[PDB]
Amino acid sequence: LAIVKFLLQNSWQPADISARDSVGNTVLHALVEVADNTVDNTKFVTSMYNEILILGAKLHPTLKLEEITNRKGLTPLALAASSGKIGVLAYILQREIHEPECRHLSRKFTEWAYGPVHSSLYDLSCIDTCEKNSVLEVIAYSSSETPNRHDMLLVEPLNRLLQDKWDRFVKRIFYFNFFVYCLYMIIFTAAAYYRPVEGLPPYKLKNTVGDYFRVTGEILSVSGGVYFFFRGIQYFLQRRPSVDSYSEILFFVQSLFMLVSVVLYFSQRKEYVASMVFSLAMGWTNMLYYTRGFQQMGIYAVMIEKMILRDLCRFMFVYLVFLFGFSTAVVTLIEDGKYNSLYSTCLELFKFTIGMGDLEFTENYDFKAVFIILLLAYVILTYILLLNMLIALMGETVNKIAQESKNIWKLQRAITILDTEKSFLKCMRKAXXXXXXXXXXX
Amino acid sequence: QQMGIYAVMIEKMILRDLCRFMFVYLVFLFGFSTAVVTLIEDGKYNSLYSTCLELFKFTIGMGDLEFTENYDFKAVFIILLLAYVILTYILLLNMLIALMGETVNKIAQESKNIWKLQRAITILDTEKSFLKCMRKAXXXXXXXXXXX
């Protein structure tokens, strides 16, 4: 500090308090860069930051220091948030200083208090910074290819601000989106459910009522399909080039699958359904995304997705190896009867895992019981040896993450809300924060 | 107080579980079952209801795998199954155990007093609901801790 002071205050050459380094960073930017999220780190950066501002306002009052952008277009705050420097982010947004010349510097003020009671007011730059970035918006995206980034959004101003929108306008908006989506699903299934059997379909359609109703559905479903593809492409354009967004990746997959089906049908190839069936299944499951976040439903939604990302690579592969090895061992074993085919035998081996295992299904073959011991091991060995260790890791986390995660849903609502307003046409919307408070402390 | 703990937990889970979970399972089963009905032209596995029921058995432990011969596109239906069978009972199951395990870090311990409330309500009502018949209506506790 003393040397910071002597640099800025000396008779010989006072430091230019707003100079930018090669990267565009000022002392406030550099301080943000030097934070490492440890408690004593925050503490020292936080008040040295404070000190710089106090000196800015004392010595050169006209200078709006916290507005100065580094090369990449980032204010100190926005850098903090881009690099998951959370303690400091919280410090910069939270701080209010009362001094002569104090008001220009301070982030927030407390308007009034009652013997009990307290009120806090927040500026708030992050919410209103539409033009380049919003503390939320950097936070809002949020790819969070890091554990730490999720933590930041929390309580101080951003977390409450997000909660506040949802009651006023946004949740009402979300339900209509969900309801609108739901009808799209009933229609896609309905046409698919009621599609005509006759071969070389249709070819051509529209006789009687039923024909008219089904045809509208088929057109409506494809049209429904285009919307995702168009929406999808825009997201690809925005976050290019980068799983940060599994739901985002999916919806696009489902829409595309529908498109392939449409491309095929006009072609009139018979299989095309192999495309429509996939498109229908992908859609209903994607219904899972929509609920978020109940906060009861939401927790359930997050966990399944996390496990699926984790589980298949570690586990789907290992199970495949155990099943693959044993199934191959069996095919060799049997001369004839269609259980020779790797595919039939492997499928027969799968049933043991489902709960439908047939044990010694096949009479055909040689060497008697060895095949059964071969089975007992695989049946004993893979579903069962494999299963115990698979439960255990979850149990060990279930020592922990479940508790860490719930905030994880919180991020999802924020991203959905942030996008709709941005993705809502940036239509007229709010753009003062304060929290009613009452703790004594008195 | 042994039976009681068991009684409270099931009721709590049932209130919690069906809305979070019965609905999600229904969605996974509903989606895949619909995908299957589309797949099959004829044979009574076309009906949403028969096909969905066939899909349920996988969850029970009675799953038939490729039950139906009827249809088109071969193996895709099986992959369609493997996913659902792999995907829902199993992907769904792991996360469902885990939340309970996380609580089972905790609530079981908090709860037992929860039964306590139930006995109190039963007792309070019978006397009130017992005709407010003549009944007691001094408390002191024998004590001995030193503290000396």
Assign 3-class secondary structure to chain A.
CHHHHHHHHCCCCCCCCCCCCCCCCCHHHHHHHHCCCCHHHHHHHHHHHHHHHHHHHHHCCCCCHHHCCCCCCCCHHHHHHHCCCHHHHHHHHHCCCCCCCHHHHCCCCCCCCCCCCEEEEECCHHHHCCCCCCHHHHHHCCCCCCHHHHHHCCHHHHHHHHHHHHHHHHHHHHHHHHHHHHHHHHHHHHHHHCCCCCCCCCCCCCCHHHHHHHHHHHHHHHHHHHHHHHHHHHHHHHCCCCCCCHHHHHHHHHHHHHHHHHHHHHHCCCCCHHHHHHHHHHHHHHHHHHCCCCCCHHHHHHHHHHHHHHHHHHHHHHHHHHHHHHHHHHHHHCCCCCCCCHHHHHHHHHHHHHCCCCCCCCCCCCCCCHHHHHHHHHHHHHHHHHHHHHHHHHHHHCCCHHHHHHHHHHHHHHHHHHHHHHCCCCCCCCCCEEEEECCCCC
Sign of CA dihedral A45, A47, A49, A51: negative
Angstroms from A365 CA to nearest CA on chain B: 24
Residue in B32, B34, B64 closest to A193 by CB: B34
Instruction: Tell me how far apart the alpha carbons of residues B130 and A148 are, in angstroms, rounded to a whole number.
Output: 60
- Cβ–Cβ under 8 Å, residues A95 and A105: no
Residues 6+ apart with CB under 8 A from A430: A165
A370 Cβ neighbours under 8 A, 6+ residues apart = none
Residue of A nearest to B33 (CA): A281
Listed residue (A251, A384, A250) closest to A308, CA to CA: A250
Q: Do A281 and B35 touch (CB under 8 A)?
A: yes
Give the residue from A354, A383, A396, A400 with the most B CB atoms within 10 Å of its CB, the best one to mutate. Answer: A354
CA dihedral (A89, A90, A91, A92) positive or negative? positive
Resolution of the deposited coordinates, in angstroms? 4.2
Distance CA A380, CA A361 (A): 16
DSSP state of B131: T
Q: Which residues pair with A21 in a beta bridge?
A: none
Measure the CA–CA gap between A119 and A121, rounded to whole angstroms. Answer: 7
Tokens 């503290």 -> residue = B147
Alpha-carbon distance of B71 to A221, in angstroms, equals 23
Q: How far apart are CA A101 and CA A61, in angstroms?
A: 8
Residue A355 burial by Cβ neighbours in a 10 Å radius (0-12, 13-18, 19+): middle
Phi, psi of A435 (to 5 degrees): -125, 130
Question: A40: which 2 tokens?
Answer: 């004593």
Tell me if A297 and B20 make a contact (CB, 8 A cut-off).
yes
Residues of A in contact with B106 (CB under 8 A): none
DSSP string, B65-121: SS-----SSTTHHHHHHHHHIIIIIIHHHHHHHHHHHHHTTTHHHHHHHHHHHHHHH
Q: Is there a contact between A285 and B28 if contact means CB atoms under 8 Å apart?
A: yes
Provide the token pair at A180: 């609108």
C-alpha distances (whole Å) from A358 to each of A163, A371, A375, B62, B75 are 54, 13, 10, 12, 21
**Method by which the coordinates were obtained:** cryo-EM
Count A/B contacts: CB-CB distance under 8 Å: 128
Is A66 in contact with A28 (CB distance < 8 Å)?
A: yes
- Nearest residue to B98 (alpha-carbon basis) of A287, A306, A316, A408: A306
Give dist(CA A350, CA A348) in Å, integer. Answer: 5
Identify the H or E element spanning B16: helix B3-17
Q: Would you mind telling me the total number of residues written for chain B in this entry? A: 148
To test the contact with chain A by mutation, choose from B16, B34, B96 the residue with the greatest count of A C-beta atoms within 10 A, namely: B34
Counting every residue written for chain A, the total comes to 442
Residue A316: list chain B partners with CB under 8 A: 86
Q: Under 8 Å CB-to-CB from B97, ≥6 apart: which residues?
A: A391, A394, A398
C-alpha–C-alpha distance, residues A86 and A159, integer Å = 13
Write the single-letter amino acid at A333.
L
Burial pattern B20-37, b for ≥16 Cβ within 10 A else e, equals: bbeebbebbbbbbbbbbb
User: Nearest CA to CA, how far is B34 from chain A (Å)?
Assistant: 7
Q: After which residues is chain B broken (C to N over 2.5 A)?
A: 137
Q: Which of B81, B37, B29 is nearest to A191 (CA)?
A: B37
Helices (H) and strands (E) in chain B, counts: 6, 0
Report how far apart, in Å, the C-alpha atoms of A154 and of each of A8, A89, A408 are.
36, 11, 10
Please name the member of A284, A288, A394 whose beta carbon is closest to the beta carbon of B97.
Answer: A394
Q: Between chains, do B38 and A390 touch, taking CB under 8 Å as contact?
A: no
Q: Which parts of A are annotated binding residues?
A: 246-247, 285, 292, 355, 358
